[PDB]
C-alpha cells in the first residue's frame with residue numbers, strides 16, 4: 001500500500017547514493033544517463049535481494065489508525081463533485097519524523113500518493129510562512145499591527161478578491177488571519193519586496209522550491225505548488241518555536257550484518273526567531289477558535305472534548321475555483337497537514353474545506369488520539385520571553401502620539417492594546433501611514449474615521 005511504495009522509493013534513493021559512493025563513482029560519472037540507470041537498477045535489486053533492515057519513523061499503531069480513519073470516514077469528504085481525494089501527513093514537531101500519513105481514499109482503486117507525490121497550490125496557508133511570519137521576524141509588524149483591506153488591484157489590473165468582496169477598510173493582523181483576507185497579505189509581501197527581505201532564505205531553509213519570488217500572489221499560493229509532506233514541514237517549523245527539522249520517513253538502513261548504509265542526520269535550523277514563532281502560534285490559535293474559515297474546533301469538541309482542549313493552532317486555504325482545500329493543524333507535539341481535491345483538478349463544493357475537510361480531519365485527529373492517547377500532548381504554546389510587548393492604539397497598532405492630518409497636528413489617543421513584537425524596541429510611535437499598505441484615499445478615509453472618535 002502507500003507506505004510500502006513510499007518507503008521503498010526513499011530506501012532505493014538512499015541505496016543509490018550508498019552504492020555510487022561505495023563503488024567510488026565521481027559526481028561527473030554520475031551525470032552519465034547509462035551509469036545512473038545502472039545504479040538505480042542495482043539499488044532496486046540490492047533492496048529486493050539484499051536483506052537490508054529499513055528502520056522508519058512510522059508509528060505502526062498511529063499509521064494503521066489513520067488508514068482505518070480514511071477507510072471509515074473518507075466518505076465525509078464526498079460533497080457532490082465526485083469522489084474527493086485526500087492527503088494527510090502527521091509529523092513530530094521536535095524531530096520532523098513522519099509518524100503516519102494518508103496517501104488517498106483507497107490504494108486498491110487509485111494509487112496516486114496525495115501525501116508525497118501530488119503538488120498543489122497551498123493557497124492561503126502560505127500567508128503565515130511567507131508574509132506575516134517573515135514581516136514579524138523582520139520587525140516590520142506585531143500582533144496588533146493594522147493592515148489595509150481597502151480595495152486594490154493586482155499588477156494585471158484585476159481586483160484582489162475575497163469570495164465576492166473587493167475589500168473593506170483597515171483591520172488588525174488577527175482579523176486578517178481569522179478571515180484570511182487577501183489584500184492585507186498582498187500588502188505584507190509587497191512591503192517585504194520593497195524592503196529587499198531575503199524571503200527565499202526563509203523558504204529554502206524549510207525546503208520549499210519557489211521559482212519566482214516576485215509573484216504578487218505568492219502569499220495567496222500563486223507561483224507555489226507543494227506536497228502535503230513538504231507543507232506540513234513548514235507548519236512544523238512554526239509549531240517547533242521556529243526550528244525546522246527536515247521531514248523524513250527513513251531513520252536508518254542497515255545491512256543484515258549491521259553495517260550502516262544510511263542514517264538520518266538532524267540539521268536543526270532556526271528559520272524564525274522564537275519570538276516570531278510564538279507570536280504566530282497565538283495568532284493561529286485564534287484562526288481555529290474563531291471558526292470563520294473552518295468548523296474544525298466545533299467538529300472536534302463534539303467528537304473528543306478533552307482532545308479539543310489541547311492547544312490547537314492552524315490555518316486553512318482554498319484555491320480560487322475551489323480545486324484545492326487545505327487545513328494545517330498543530331499542537332506543540334505534532335503537526336497534521338491535510339489537502340483535499342480532485343486528481344483532474346476539477347472544482348470541489350464551496351464548503352468542502354470549511355465543513356467536509358474540517359469534519360474528516362476532526363475524525364482523523366480523534367483516530368490518532370484513540371491509537372496513541374498521549375501523542376498530541378497537553379502542553380500549551382506560549383510567548384517566548386524574548387517577545388517585546390508594546391502598548392499601542394487599537395486604531396493604528398502604533399504607540400500614542402501626534403500626527404499631521406490635513407496639515408494640522410492631531411493628538412492621537414484612545415483605547416490601547418498589548419501588541420507582541422519580535423524586534424528589540426517593539427512598536428513605533430503612530431505615523432500618518434500607520435498601516436501595512438493602503439492608498440492616500442484609503443488613509444484619508446481611515447484618518448477621517450479615527451479623528452471622528454477623538
Ligand SMILES: *C(=O)[C@@H](NC(=O)[C@@H](C)NC(=O)CCCCCN=[N+]=[N-])[C@@H](C)O
Nearest residue numbers: 123124180217220221222317318319320
Ligand atoms: C486563501 O486560501 C484565499 N484564497 C487563495 O489564496 C486563492 C485565491 N489562491 C489561489 O487560488 C492560488 C493562486 C493565486 C490567486 C491570486 N489571484 N488570482 N487569480 C481565500 C481566503 O480567499
Ligand SMILES: [Cl-]
Nearest residue numbers: 001002003004
Ligand atoms: Cl499505507
Ligand SMILES: [Cl-]
Nearest residue numbers: 002005006113
Ligand atoms: Cl506510494
Ligand SMILES: [Cl-]
Nearest residue numbers: 019023042046
Ligand atoms: Cl554489488
Ligand SMILES: [Cl-]
Nearest residue numbers: 058059060061
Ligand atoms: Cl511502531
Ligand SMILES: [Cl-]
Nearest residue numbers: 116227229230
Ligand atoms: Cl515531499
Ligand SMILES: [Cl-]
Nearest residue numbers: 119120121324
Ligand atoms: Cl494547484
Ligand SMILES: [Cl-]
Nearest residue numbers: 151152153154
Ligand atoms: Cl490599485
Ligand SMILES: [Cl-]
Nearest residue numbers: 162163180318
Ligand atoms: Cl473566502
Ligand SMILES: [Cl-]
Nearest residue numbers: 174175178290
Ligand atoms: Cl476577527
Ligand SMILES: [Cl-]
Nearest residue numbers: 198199200213
Ligand atoms: Cl527573496
Ligand SMILES: [Cl-]
Nearest residue numbers: 208209226230
Ligand atoms: Cl516545495
Ligand SMILES: [Cl-]
Nearest residue numbers: 212213214215
Ligand atoms: Cl526575486
Ligand SMILES: [Cl-]
Nearest residue numbers: 010248249250
Ligand atoms: Cl525519508
Ligand SMILES: [Cl-]
Nearest residue numbers: 255256257258
Ligand atoms: Cl550483510
Ligand SMILES: [Cl-]
Nearest residue numbers: 272273274275
Ligand atoms: Cl530566537
